[PDB]
Design an enzyme around this catalytic site. Sequence first.
Site, PDB file in Angstrom:
ATOM      1  N   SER A   1       0.811  -1.218   0.000  1.00  0.00           N
ATOM      2  CA  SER A   1       0.000   0.000   0.000  1.00  0.00           C
ATOM      3  C   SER A   1       0.850   1.278   0.000  1.00  0.00           C
ATOM      4  O   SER A   1       0.269   2.359  -0.142  1.00  0.00           O
ATOM      5  CB  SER A   1      -0.911   0.037   1.174  1.00  0.00           C
ATOM      6  OG  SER A   1      -2.016  -0.852   1.021  1.00  0.00           O
TER       7      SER A   1
ATOM      8  N   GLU B   1      -3.466  -7.802  -6.683  1.00  0.00           N
ATOM      9  CA  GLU B   1      -2.354  -8.621  -7.151  1.00  0.00           C
ATOM     10  C   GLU B   1      -0.978  -7.986  -6.842  1.00  0.00           C
ATOM     11  O   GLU B   1       0.052  -8.668  -6.789  1.00  0.00           O
ATOM     12  CB  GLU B   1      -2.541  -8.889  -8.653  1.00  0.00           C
ATOM     13  CG  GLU B   1      -3.981  -8.810  -9.157  1.00  0.00           C
ATOM     14  CD  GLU B   1      -4.336  -7.598 -10.032  1.00  0.00           C
ATOM     15  OE1 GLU B   1      -3.521  -7.038 -10.957  1.00  0.00           O
ATOM     16  OE2 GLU B   1      -5.554  -7.276  -9.775  1.00  0.00           O
TER      17      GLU B   1
HETATM   18  C1  LIG Z   1      -2.026  -2.087   1.661  1.00  0.00           C
HETATM   19  O1  LIG Z   1      -0.964  -2.698   1.683  1.00  0.00           O
HETATM   20  N1  LIG Z   1      -3.201  -2.730   1.693  1.00  0.00           N
HETATM   21  C2  LIG Z   1      -4.500  -2.102   1.946  1.00  0.00           C
HETATM   22  C3  LIG Z   1      -4.971  -2.595   3.327  1.00  0.00           C
HETATM   23  N2  LIG Z   1      -4.048  -2.213   4.391  1.00  0.00           N
HETATM   24  O2  LIG Z   1      -3.784  -0.813   4.608  1.00  0.00           O
HETATM   25  S1  LIG Z   1      -2.249  -0.552   5.132  1.00  0.00           S
HETATM   26  O3  LIG Z   1      -1.381  -1.406   4.354  1.00  0.00           O
HETATM   27  O4  LIG Z   1      -2.003   0.814   4.797  1.00  0.00           O
HETATM   28  O5  LIG Z   1      -2.103  -0.809   6.549  1.00  0.00           O
HETATM   29  C4  LIG Z   1      -5.052  -4.121   3.360  1.00  0.00           C
HETATM   30  C5  LIG Z   1      -3.810  -4.835   2.827  1.00  0.00           C
HETATM   31  C6  LIG Z   1      -3.175  -4.179   1.592  1.00  0.00           C
HETATM   32  C7  LIG Z   1      -3.891  -4.577   0.305  1.00  0.00           C
HETATM   33  N3  LIG Z   1      -3.754  -3.809  -0.959  1.00  0.00           N
HETATM   34  O6  LIG Z   1      -4.549  -5.589   0.335  1.00  0.00           O
END
Ligand SMILES: *C(=O)N1C[C@H](NOS(=O)(=O)O)CC[C@H]1C(N)=O
EC number: 3.5.2.6
Length: 267
Positions: A46, A145
């Site tokens: 993320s 993905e």
């Molecule tokens: C980011 O890696 N993602 C969005 C969400 N988590 O927010 S965080 O990473 O900023 O803490 C879930 C996991 C992940 C995603 N794209 O699934």
Amino acid sequence: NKSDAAAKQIKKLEEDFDGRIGVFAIDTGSGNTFGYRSDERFPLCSSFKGFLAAAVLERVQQKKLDINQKVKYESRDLEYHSPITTKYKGSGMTLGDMASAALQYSDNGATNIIMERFLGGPEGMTKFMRSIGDNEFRLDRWELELNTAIPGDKRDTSTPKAVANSLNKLALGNVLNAKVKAIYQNWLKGNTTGDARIRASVPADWVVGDKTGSCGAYGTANDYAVIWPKNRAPLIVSIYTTRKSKDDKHSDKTIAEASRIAIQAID
Ligand SMILES: *C(=O)N1C[C@H](NOS(=O)(=O)O)CC[C@H]1C(N)=O
Ligand SMILES: [Cl-]
Ligand SMILES: [Cl-]
């Protein structure tokens, strides 16, 4: 030798939880820096969303986009983890509200929509990073993905140093004008996901803007931050981790600790 001591400490921490830590930190007031594994590749997860928000603001600045243009998506199947876009599906959101959701709540619908319609997908996201002089960053896939964090895969990775240099350029430097940079800073300062990470490594009266990443596989997780210490010029901290095994969970505490060490290394 202060670099050497900090290196020994990170090396030990990464061995304690059976994984890999990458660090880059800059004191903008002296130019002093600390890196460990600073040129090695780590999944972005993320964290790239913080750069994706910078790219929107550059587009706004260039008058290619307007910050308040209505973005509509009433028929779309929102990706998993779209807490913010799911609340506004009926009505649409402003482009600025969308981008800030992608940053401060990691909203996946917001991310996908913005890459599809305004940024030219993962290649366009990469293009923007090259255009600020970042040669390490690459985004290869879409949400969800991009999160697989397969060991040895170089897709959707960057390096701690390059992420730190890029956040320097975006949050403190001159890619964005004084107006539009202030907005980015505010977005950063109001991130909602980072309380157990770089934020927990610094006094409560230091002001911090950050963006976290949690792939959810391979114990893979990260954080990058601008820190405005009281009465001192800003710091940049970039912390990336992987773990050996697929089911391993990420360790907030290792990130926080790695940030504490990195921030003493450039003291
Ligand atoms: C980011 O890696 N993602 C969005 C969400 N988590 O927010 S965080 O990473 O900023 O803490 C879930 C996991 C992940 C995603 N794209 O699934
Ligand atoms: Cl990067
Ligand atoms: Cl944080």
